[PDB]
């Protein structure tokens, strides 16, 4: 319902609220299915590379999948 109502948001805050809602939906997916969560994580990272929680969660999921074989990514994020 929040995503449906996002169409009525003022354009100034529309980008920020869309990013927030997509992050929340990606969290719900990560609870349900990690693949869609990672997809939305990539979508938001392309949309806003400056956000940290998205990158943290994406790298954390990658480390879970790669058994901590992305130490370079963690160092770069640090």
């Amino acid at each position: 319902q929040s995503l449906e109502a996002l169409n009525n948001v003022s354009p100034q805050n529309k980008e920020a609220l869309s990013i927030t809602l997509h992050y929340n939906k990606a969290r719900v997916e990560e609870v349900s299915n990690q693949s869609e969560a990672e997809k939305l994580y990539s979508k938001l990272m392309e949309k806003c590379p400056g956000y940290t929680s998205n990158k943290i969660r994406y790298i954390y999921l990658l480390a879970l999948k790669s058994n901590g074989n992305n130490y370079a990514d963690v160092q770069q994020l640090l």
């Binding site: 980008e15 920020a16 806003c48 400056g50 956000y51």
Partner: peptide
């Protein structure tokens, strides 16, 4: 520096 991030 991004007003969007702020």
């Amino acid at each position: 520096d991004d007003p969007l991030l702020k």
